Design a binder for this molecule. Structure first.
Ligand SMILES: CCCCCCCCCCCC(=O)OC[C@H](COP(=O)(O)OCC[N+](C)(C)C)OC(=O)CCCCCCCCCCC
Ligand SMILES: CCCCCCCCCC(=O)OC[C@H](COP(=O)(O)OCC[N+](C)(C)C)OC(=O)CCCCCCCCC
Ligand SMILES: CCCCCCCCCC(=O)OC[C@H](COP(=O)(O)OCC[N+](C)(C)C)OC(=O)CCCCCCCCC
Ligand SMILES: CCCCCC(=O)OC[C@H](COP(=O)(O)OCC[N+](C)(C)C)OC(=O)CCCCC
Ligand SMILES: CCCCCC(=O)OC[C@H](COP(=O)(O)OCC[N+](C)(C)C)OC(=O)CCCCC
Ligand SMILES: CCCCCCCCCC
Ligand SMILES: CCCCCCCCCC
Ligand SMILES: CCCCCCCCCC
Ligand SMILES: [Cu+2]
Ligand SMILES: [Cu+2]
Ligand SMILES: [Cu+2]
Ligand SMILES: [Cu+2]
Lengths: 382, 236, 382
């Protein structure tokens, strides 16, 4: 929801999300929904974004309407920040448990230490039920099961109220007598030495001694109970296992890419060389969370968000099968209302008019090839 | 007589000398002045540096010593008319100081900006700096010290004490010259760049601020002007 | 021209320029001269120089005596800073258009973000004609052709003169009356409240209102004209394509390298092992823009700058052909006046007495091998 505001070129060349899937579109309270997919870290990572040496797999959502039960990069849990390598592809999986009823736009996002939020595609997920039914049980290594919704809440309230009461008692003890104007006049007109006299000093000594003694006793009591404690577990996690993708058999060279100002279409001329041993056909162009599809070649069945999906938004001048070894140059047009709705056309405002994206090539059998393209994006006005 | 034609000479000497200096650096900027280890660099810019440093030291010594030796011993028996004449002469000195400050701190300083932005810094003694750090800065320092000494030795208002604004106006801009040590150190050790706004240049900035003491100096000279011959007319 | 001043070891181990070529040595005004070559980023990059993560392909020259029409790293235009990888070799090409008559020493240089200028070999290029004939036309995406020499100059002059005139009018309006001493005396002796009176306040209100209104109107007018504008295009460019050099079939081990103080010669003992299947011979030693050649093995035909070229400056103790599989140790002496002219002998002043360079090995057929050597450089006095 915070996207459509970030720079178009920055959204185009940071992280490309694809093969996204959602286990459910509509869930009950306490029910789990799983979000899977892959993200590729673009090689032309903008210099204004710090390299993803410290990155966190986050979820874009309006507060804890879901709780993040688990999150994985590769196949291992990532509750801490992780190190990503530029040019690598990683698979991810986030498990969410529904907590608050409503219709929520859930994004998978990557927060980068010195670059800010990189928001992936967002999907509307409906939660039904009551928040009062939500439970978040955890079992500790000390053998007790607690609900994270209300665990320690009473203790927190008690201690805060107790210390607030002590402070209020101190202030009220001094506030029984007149406060401001008579005391000011006594201090000014001559030596005061009369508004602070025993047993005021005795009360202050009692307050100080009781405060120190109560702090010490409470610490000792909180040590006898909960004798086993550990510090907060933190630290960036290295060694994220990237995907071992095969080298693509399709090479694409971008010769000029243009978009009309104003307009809802982006045009580029590609020289595609087909290696391997099967006829290929261009089926998809993904630029920034927006999938332009050639409906005659590929159809989306993963329930991709409709406002981000252009079913027939990709038109290839010659999308006939490309025989192996053959090289041809085609004009590719990616047109959809999403290009203006998600403010991809506002790259004219950007100080770096370069685009990046993913091309998906499909053969007759159905297996697909992912090739990455990047080029300057030249506006056209006349 | 009052204000005489010493003001014309004060403007013209700086104008002519610095126009000739600009012509010289235009002729020998490239072509004996790009390569600091080339033999003609020594005869066209190192010799310039040596000669200008020697002449600056000699001129400063002679001028300051003469101004201090010819100091007015009997300042009490100075008539208001001669005091007005001396106030005008001191104002001419201040005009010369302002002109020299302009030439040093604006013209040749930004001129060194362009030079160092268009060529590769080759030494601590480039043609631009020879003209800026070691000619124009010493020249305005000499002029400012001379103006201060003239005020102290001829004007009873500026006698019987060291004027704080005048001392700041004269010494602060002088501190830009030893600040060149920070410039060279900050260009060779810090900041392998040619950023003109680099913090290695804040030494010039801070001590360039002290030239704002000209405001206190000038109200002091206004009061010195308006001592006996303040009018009448003025407030009348 | 700014070299011969930098540290000798820093010039030796940053970037090695070779295969340099110049399309022309003498050009007319508006004529193009092209500079080609390769540079290798040395593996032992000094720690005092920041890694070339942000580098700019620049031209060393006395101001815009040429204009940089184009510059390429790999095969793609690089008008912005680029990222280089240590140990990689890149090919470059700079196109220059002559603008100012004279004899100019043109260097190809690489500026590194945190290290400063790395100046390559410089060549004297003669420009003839008149600067008044120079034209720099560009065609905008709005369909107008302008000359960059004088485009917008009149508008700039007009606006600056207009605002300067407004300020001068304000000052002169206040300067018609006496300025300093009477006003000072009025302010001091009693309340002033007399030197600022209507219509002075009305004139000031008029000045303020006119300033704001003129700024707004001028901005709107400059918006109606030039309705299409883009911000400055900036940002480091990643993904520079390095050269795909074959692995050298020659391995060289440096056993001690010495230079006499004082002297114009550098001596080193190399153990050369010849792999592959052809007899090789040492033909060149390049250390820092200085090419020491063994004239009996290789001759320069690219018009390398004479003061940087030692035609017979390389003497090998046994430069007979090295049969494949054979290993031999030879004494190599690189001697030329350039070693002292370019202050390569002033490495004795450096805090890191290590050298690096390139050895070029040639077989009978003429094909060449580039091997990189680096070792401590020990001065010898007795
Ligand atoms: C506050 C006290 C300041 C003291 C420092 C003053 C520095 C003076 C210049 C140093 C020159 C140097 O050092 O160079 C000496 C130069 C080197 O040029 P050349 O190779 O002989 O070529 C021929 C000479 N041309 C290139 C000038 C034609 O030759 C000279 O003898 C001539 C120097 C003339 C200086 C006096 C004229 C100044 C303009 C007129 C208004 C005053
Ligand atoms: C290129 C070298 C030029 C040097 C020129 C120096 C001239 C001699 C300085 C001097 O004494 O002042 C000259 C004038 C008029 O002041 P005088 O009346 O001569 O001062 C003596 C006063 N006394 C009779 C009561 C003893 O007072 C002035 O206002 C002179 C200003 C001249 C311009 C500043 C040049 C300084 C260069 C470092
Ligand atoms: C380099 C940085 C300067 C540091 C700043 C310190 C000076 C600031 C205060 C100042 O200028 O006062 C010194 C006198 C003014 O008179 P007084 O300070 O009252 O003392 C006069 C007797 N004295 C000349 C021995 C000093 O002024 C003079 O008498 C100066 C003229 C005599 C010096 C001439 C010889 C110098 C040749 C190089
Ligand atoms: C208030 C500062 C004035 C600075 C003017 C200046 O730098 O002049 C040098 C420049 C040099 O350009 P140009 O006149 O073409 O003569 C070239 C001669 N060289 C190359 C030696 C400067 O132009 C002039 O000499 C005009 C004279 C202005 C008198 C106040
Ligand atoms: C009043 C503001 C001063 C701010 C100082 C500043 O901008 O420093 C930038 C610099 C950061 O260096 P950087 O800009 O990356 O320099 C790049 C070029 N090299 C690496 C050759 C220095 O930081 C320092 O080294 C400490 C400065 C101390 C000031 C009292
Ligand atoms: C001056 C008060 C110091 C209190 C120290 C208490 C130490 C208790 C150790 C558990
Ligand atoms: C590399 C970070 C440099 C930070 C400099 C801070 C300067 C503050 C001056 C008070
Ligand atoms: C107080 C003056 C504010 C001026 C605002 C002008 C807005 C014009 C929009 C083009
Ligand atoms: Cu959203
Ligand atoms: Cu990608
Ligand atoms: Cu040069
Ligand atoms: Cu190298």
């Amino acid at each position: 929801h915070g996207e459509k505001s970030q720079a178009a070129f920055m959204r185009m060349r940071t992280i490309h999300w694809y093969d996204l899937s959602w286990s459910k579109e509509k869930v009950k309270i306490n029910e789990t929904v799983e979000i899977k997919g892959k993200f590729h870290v673009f090689e032309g990572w903008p210099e204004t974004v710090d390299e993803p040496d410290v990155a966190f797999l986050n979820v874009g959502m309006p507060g804890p309407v879901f709780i993040r039960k688990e999150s994985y990069i590769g196949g291992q849990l990532v509750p801490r920040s992780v190190r990503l390598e530029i040019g690598k592809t990683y698979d991810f999986r986030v498990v969410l448990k529904a907590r608050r009823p409503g219709d929520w736009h859930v994004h998978t996002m990557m927060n980068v230490q010195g670059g800010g939020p990189i928001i992936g595609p967002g999907k509307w997920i409906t939660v039904e039920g009551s928040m009062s039914e939500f439970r978040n049980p955890v079992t500790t290594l000390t053998g007790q099961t607690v609900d994270l919704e209300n665990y320690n809440e009473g203790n927190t309230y008690f201690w805060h109220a107790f210390w607030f009461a002590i402070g209020v008692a101190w202030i009220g003890y001094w506030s029984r007598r007149p406060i401001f104007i008579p005391r000011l006049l006594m201090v000014d007109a001559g030596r005061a030495d009369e508004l602070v006299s025993a047993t005021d000093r005795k009360v202050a000594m009692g307050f100080l001694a009781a405060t120190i003694l109560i702090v010490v006793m409470a610490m000792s009591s909180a040590n006898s109970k909960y004798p086993i404690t550990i510090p907060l577990q933190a630290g960036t996690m290295r060694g994220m296992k990237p995907l071992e993708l095969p080298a693509p058999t399709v090479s694409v060279k971008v010769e000029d890419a243009t978009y009309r100002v104003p307009g809802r279409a982006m045009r580029m001329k590609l020289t595609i060389t087909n290696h391997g041993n099967s006829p290929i056909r261009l089926g998809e162009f993904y630029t920034a969370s927006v999938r332009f599809l050639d409906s005659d070649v590929y159809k989306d069945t993963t329930g991709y968000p409709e406002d981000l999906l252009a079913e027939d938004g990709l038109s290839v001048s010659d999308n006939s099968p490309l025989a192996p070894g053959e090289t041809r140059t085609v004009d590719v047009t990616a047109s959809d209302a999403a290009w203006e709705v998600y403010r991809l056309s506002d790259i004219i405002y950007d100080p770096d008019s370069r685009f990046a994206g993913l091309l998906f090539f499909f053969d007759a059998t159905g297996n697909r090839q992912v090739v990455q393209i990047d080029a300057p994006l030249i506006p056209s006005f006349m | 007589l009052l204000d005489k034609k010493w003001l014309t000479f004060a403007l013209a000497i700086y104008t002519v000398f610095y126009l000739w200096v600009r012509w010289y650096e235009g002729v020998y900027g490239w072509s004996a002045g790009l390569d600091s280890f080339a033999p003609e660099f020594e005869t066209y810019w190192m010799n310039f540096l040596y000669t200008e440093i020697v002449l600056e030291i000699v001129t400063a010594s002679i001028l300051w010593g003469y101004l201090w030796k010819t100091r007015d011993r009997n300042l009490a028996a100075l008539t208001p008319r001669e005091e007005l004449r001396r106030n005008f002469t001191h104002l001419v000195w201040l005009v010369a100081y302002a002109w020299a400050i302009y030439w040093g701190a604006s013209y040749f300083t930004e001129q060194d900006g362009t030079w160092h932005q268009t060529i590769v810094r080759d030494t601590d003694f480039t043609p631009s700096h020879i003209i800026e750090f070691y000619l124009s800065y010493p020249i305005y320092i000499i002029t400012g010290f001379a103006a201060f000494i003239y005020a102290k030795t001829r004007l009873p208002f500026f006698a019987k004490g060291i004027s704080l604004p005048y001392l700041v106006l004269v010494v602060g801009p002088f501190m830009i010259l030893p600040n060149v040590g920070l410039n060279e150190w900050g260009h060779t050790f810090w900041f392998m760049e040619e950023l003109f706004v680099a913090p290695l240049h804040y030494g010039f900035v801070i001590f360039g601020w002290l030239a704002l003491a000209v405001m206190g100096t000038l109200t002091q000279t206004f009061y010195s002007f308006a001592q006996g011959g303040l009018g009448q007319s003025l407030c009348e």
